[PDB]
Each structure stands twice: as C-alpha cells, then as structure tokens.
Subunit: 151 residues, 6 copies
Amino acid sequence: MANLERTFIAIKPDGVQRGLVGEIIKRFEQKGFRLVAMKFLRASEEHLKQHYIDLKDRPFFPGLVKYMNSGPVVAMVWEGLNVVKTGRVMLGETNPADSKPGTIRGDFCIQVGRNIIHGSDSVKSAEKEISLWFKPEELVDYKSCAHDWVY
Amino acid sequence: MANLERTFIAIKPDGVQRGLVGEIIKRFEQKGFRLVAMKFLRASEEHLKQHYIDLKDRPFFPGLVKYMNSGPVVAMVWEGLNVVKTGRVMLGETNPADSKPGTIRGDFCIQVGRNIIHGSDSVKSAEKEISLWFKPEELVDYKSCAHDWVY
Amino acid sequence: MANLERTFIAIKPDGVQRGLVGEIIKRFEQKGFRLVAMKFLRASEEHLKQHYIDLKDRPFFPGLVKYMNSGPVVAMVWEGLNVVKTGRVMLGETNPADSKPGTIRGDFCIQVGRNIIHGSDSVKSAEKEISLWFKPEELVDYKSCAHDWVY
Amino acid sequence: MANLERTFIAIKPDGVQRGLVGEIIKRFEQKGFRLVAMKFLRASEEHLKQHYIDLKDRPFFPGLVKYMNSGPVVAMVWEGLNVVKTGRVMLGETNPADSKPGTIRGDFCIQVGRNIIHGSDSVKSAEKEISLWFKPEELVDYKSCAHDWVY
Amino acid sequence: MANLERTFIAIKPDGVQRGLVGEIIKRFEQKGFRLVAMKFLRASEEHLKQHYIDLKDRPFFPGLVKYMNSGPVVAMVWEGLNVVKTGRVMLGETNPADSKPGTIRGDFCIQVGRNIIHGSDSVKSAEKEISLWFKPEELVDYKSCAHDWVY
Amino acid sequence: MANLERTFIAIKPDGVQRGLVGEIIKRFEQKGFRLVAMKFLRASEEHLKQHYIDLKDRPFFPGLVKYMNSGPVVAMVWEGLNVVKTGRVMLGETNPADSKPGTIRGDFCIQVGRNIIHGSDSVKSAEKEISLWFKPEELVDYKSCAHDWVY
C-alpha cells in the first residue's frame, strides 16, 4: 501494494557494550531496508523521560531512565515497506524470554531489563520518536542501487 | 522412517542481483541436503510460461513471466528426507511479509513481488519442475561423505 | 525476577563429525549464557545406559547406546536465567522435522536419529545429568565481564 | 606500552550502497576497538573539499568531491592502542588491487575509485579529520566492559 | 583504468563434499565479481585430460584425472576488473601449506592433493578453460545493480 | 607427503571472557583439523608455572602466571598434517600488533598481554604441553567422515 514507511530503531547501552552494533545494522541491511539516519550519543535523562512519557507513571520509569543514560546508544531511522511491523518482528518480543531464535533479541539477549534494542511500536510512535531523536536535516534521502530488486 | 525425496529450488533474478546465491546454497548445505543438480541461466519467457501454466489464467501472469526473464536465475535440485516440505520451511512464507526471521525470505526480502527464491510446493510439482528445468543427465548421483551422520 | 539456572548441553557424535561444535558453542555465547564446564569424550555404553535409564525399556535403547558411543561427544554445562527452557528453544524440537529455521537442529539436521545435540528437559534432569557427566571440581565458577549488561 | 589513540574511519557512498556498514563496524568491534562517535550524513562538496585540501590540485580532486557527495557516508571515530596504524591494516591497501584477502577492501571491493572506506593515514591527520567531521560534544566517552580483557 | 576480465573458477570434488560451495560463491559475490555462468557436473576423465593437457606428461596426471572424476564439481565463470589475478589471490596459493589465512584455501584446506578449488592461472588459460567447460550460450549476460558502485 | 602431527591450542582467559571460543574452534574445524581432546578448566598457578618453565627467569613470569589463573581456559589438542606450523599461522603473530587480518589474533585482539590464545611453537613443545595438560585417556581417537576429502 500500500505504501512504504519509516521506523526508529535504537540500540541500547547493553547492545553497544556487548558489541552487537554491526550485527544489528547488518541484519536490517540484508533485509532490504534503508538507513535514513544514524547517530551515536548518550541520551540525557531529560531526553529519555520525553522518550518514555507514556511510562512516567510506571514503577520502573526512574530505573529505565537512569539505565538508558548509563551508556551511549545508536539511534537510527530505517525506511521500507512496513518497516515498523516487520522491524519489530526482526527484533523479537520485547521480553527476550519470548523472543524466538533467529531474531535479534532471541539470538543475543536474556532479560527484559537488558533487551539490547528498541523498535517503534507503531507508525504514530515512529514519527514521534524520529522527531524526538532526529533533526529533519539528519534524515538523508538517497536511493539504494538494489531498490528495484527489493520492490 | 518413510523415504527421502528431492525438490526444485530456484533463485530468482533479484536473489542473484542482490548477491544471495552463496547464502542460500550454504543454508541448504549446512542442513544436510545434497545438491543433485545446479545451473545458471536466464529462463526464456516461453520456458517460464510452462513453469507457470497453473497461473496462466491469473492477472499477474504476464508480469510474472516478464519478471523471471529480466535476469538470470540459479536452478537447483536438492535431495533429502522431506526436502520439499522442510525446504519450503527454510524458504519461509511465499509472502516475505509472513516469513519468519531465520528463514531465507524472512532474512533477505520484503515484498512478495521480489521474494528472491522459489521452492516446489509438493513432490508432484517437484518432479514436474525438475523435468521442465533439468535434463536427466544433469542430475548428478554421488554420496555425501557425512551421509551416515545425517541419516 | 526469579533465579538463574544451569543446564547440560551435549553435542552428539554426528554434531562433532559434521563440524558444528564452534557454531553450537558460539550460539550459546552470543545469547549471554556462560560456560560452566566443558569436556570432550567418547561416552562408554555403560555411562550412556545410565544417562538413558528412563528409556532402557524402549526398542531404540540398545541402538541409542551403540549410537552415542560411536563417536566422541562434547559435554557442557551452561548457566543463565532459565537456561534449561531457553536452551531447548535454541536447540529446536528434538525431532529435526519440527525444529524451526533459526534453531540449531532447524539449521543443521534432518533426522531424529541424527539430531546432533542434547539439552536437559528440566532442571531436575539437568542437575542429574550434570552430576552423571561432570565431577564437582570440573564446574568452573567465574564471572562474565558483561554480566551486568545481560542482567 | 606506549599510549592508546583515536582514528577517523569513514564508510564511503559505495560501501553504504552495497550494504557493508554492519560488516565494517562489526570488524572493528570484534578487534577490541571502541566506537567513540558515529554519524550518518551526505558530506557537502564544501566539507569534502576541506577534507581533501591536500589534494585540491590533483587531476581527480573535482571527481573525488562530486563522488563523495553522491551518497551518504558513515563517519566514525574509533579508539584503541594504535588505532590509526592497525585500523588502516584492517582496511587494506588504499588500492583494492593490493589489498590482501582478509581485509575490508581485500574482501569487499575491486577498484581504487570505489574503495568503500577511508582510514586516517596518521595521528596528525586523524585529529584533523576528527575535528573537521565531528563536534567535540559528539565524541562519547564510556568504558567498554571488556576493556581489562583487551588491555 | 585498463579493462575488465573473466575467469574460470572450479570447485573440486572435495570442496563440494565438504560443503564449501556456498562459502566460496559468497566470497566472490561480496567482492563485486559477477557470475557469468555456473554448472554442477562430474567431469569425465576424457574432459579432464583435456583440461590437464599441459600436465599429461607429469607423474601425478593419472591420479589427478581419477581424482577430479571421483565426484561432481561446480564450474563457474566470474567477470570483473582483473578477475584472474585477484581471483587467484582470493584462492590462495595452490599449495594450501602456503595459502595465507583469509583465503579460501588458507581457511578451508590442508593438503595440495585436496586443495578444494581451481582458478585460471592467466587470461589466456581462462579463455581456454571457459571454452572447454562452457558452451557459449551458457555465459549469461546481465548487469549487476551495484555495478556503478563497484566501478 | 611426510606425516600428520598434533598440537596444543589453549584459549586464554580473555578469549573465553570475550566469547571467542566458538569462533576459534569453528576455524580449526573448517580448516580440516580434528579435535583430539578438549577441556575447560582454571589452570592453577602451579600447573601454569610448569607450562611456563622456560620463562621462569623472565620479568613477566609472575604476572603471566597470575594472569592465566585469573579465569578459565579451554585446552585442546588438534590433529592434522603440520598442525603445529599451520595452527600458529592461523593464530597469527604472538604479538597482536603484527598479526595479520584474517588470523585469530589479527581479527580479535590488540595487546600482547591479552592475546586471547596459545599454540605450540614446535612438535617437541606440542607433545610436552599435551602431556602436561592432558591425560592420555583424554585424547580421543576417531575418524573424521571427510578425512579422505582433506587428505
């Protein structure tokens, strides 16, 4: 048929620390998705509270914010037909315990607390996050040489 | 138981173009299936119409034929206990959208139009396709050194 | 939561012969599990009968014993939150025919007879097997440098 | 020783387009180097002329600038003992024809024109480039959990 | 330058038997070389003697022929700037003993008797071999979607 | 031749900690070498002093002993034509700074202090170490199914 899309994928502190950046990026590349934007940064607690506003009234919130600020993250935007839905499928269940082998979480992590990566839950959330994490001039627009072979 | 089998596996133009030949063959090798035959060729529209006879009364047919002729493909025959059934599972759903991560399609493609590969839907179709794509002197008969460790 | 765990993973003769030792170990490593103990040995028929006591009445038993003694195996102990349950999920169904792509059996084997690997079915079994296969001074205790990033 | 170091690694338009970002990053990670900074951008011709000042009189200069602006690049900073020297070794010869198998260039490219990646030629150049490509607040400082095992 | 090229690459019986087809093809794909033609067949002793005419008066010849006929091989043609020269470098020394790690032979074989693969020693030999192993209508002519990113 | 051989390969504490066990083993497997014996253990300082007798009068000795006892190691014995010589080539230079990309050390480590692995320098040393680290009954003798394809 219906239309392509866009999604926000972020590699959490543990994913970076355990050296899974290349593996994660590689997987998206080999799938046929395109890297619109990518930056490495240590998200401030302020920025993170904004990212987790819908969970500010959840027990874990404080820990989650302290957590995501403990180390640098890799924030990215991937484009493609249904990126949000399939992207999350590639990520696996948010709880590594339910993530099936073959998926990023299912292959690389164990606990929900340390689930190495984040994927937007919907197109509505995707655009929100993308705006919160990226500046419009950061989203690079180019055309993949194999685009016509993926679509 | 009950008996082995044999199936027709074809790597479509997009699979070849995006450089997934080695990956796809490799996957079948590591599983324990044996390469009976393999050839690289640009299937003529005529040959393709024959391959897709059961879909000659379907809207997409004309495009499908034009499609499969746009570039060379890698036609192969793989032998093994239940190759047809398991081979397809290894391929993933025909619609990349439903292909689960870990499968060829699930890991390498996005759209059904460009689903990089083809596997026989049944033993009956397998034998038909094998005959349509290969000459009897092209199916090599040998024995894998690890055969007794697989079976 | 609730508590960690510990499980017994054994790479069968066919798994060793087909050179899948590195792949199998690698997989457990990348998941975040820790190698507590590992040894390479040709399990005697006596030792194997003990391992398969619960099946000493079934027709396959004598073959299974002769089988597992036909070549060396790699016996290991892996520690982690829910190792027994997730470990088996990583292994796939005991019957390679039902093992999903992405899993060890699903990627590397075909027949149940030659299913390349064994994982404990439960914590109760795990501890039994661990005792049967390893000596208490063989289970090494150390701390993975990325432990706090997995947990 | 004697002291660590810091180097500027940039994945050129062709390296991105051919989907080698993950492979390249992965290699540096597995080596024990640490990602200090990373950003995805389409370097402007102006910015590129500055990057290639020492070559602004050579026959190729204009082409080189037009080239590097044709698609987005991945700019990074890697830290580690002798990153500049070893990093380039990992990259291979600047001319893919002389790059040995096992290296990034030796494994992934053919022509010098399209040599997929750039590595600083010296610590002096490294700091220059790092300043030209990154803002001081972009270089993230954290400690790898396996630092004491690499050092 | 000066001009491209084309070369004859053949995966010997041992390479096929040990399951290195996917790995070897994959390596050529990731380099940017294009598969012009590929077939799976058991080279007849007669055909092989022709291939080894320049060694028909050498001690090993008799065995070499018996050898190459013992199992099926994978004959292929790869196009690219300097394929013959670089292709051989990718293969490693003909004597696995001197093949450096990172090369096909260096990573996968030990003895010269079983050196898993063959590459043309020169453009002149290449064309000879291509003609001896392939029929002109078997060399497929297409254009890789990433061609302009490789050259 | 002239004759086969055998060698002692030990994965050091850092190699284990950084999760490179599967990678290292995998590499020896894919080469065609056979695993004769393997055990996981924390080598006592006593046992280590014996292993490093020839260096007991060298400055670093005390540290080297404390070092190798800091974590568990994976001790193995690999059989094959020229294992000692080629094995070390696969390991790379003892000083990771000189280890070429493609080799274990060249791909995974940086400092000599933490060079992740050990390989015997000679057949004379190999047998010494093998005796020092393994008990005769631990060296398993079996035959690789692809032996005739490697030799």
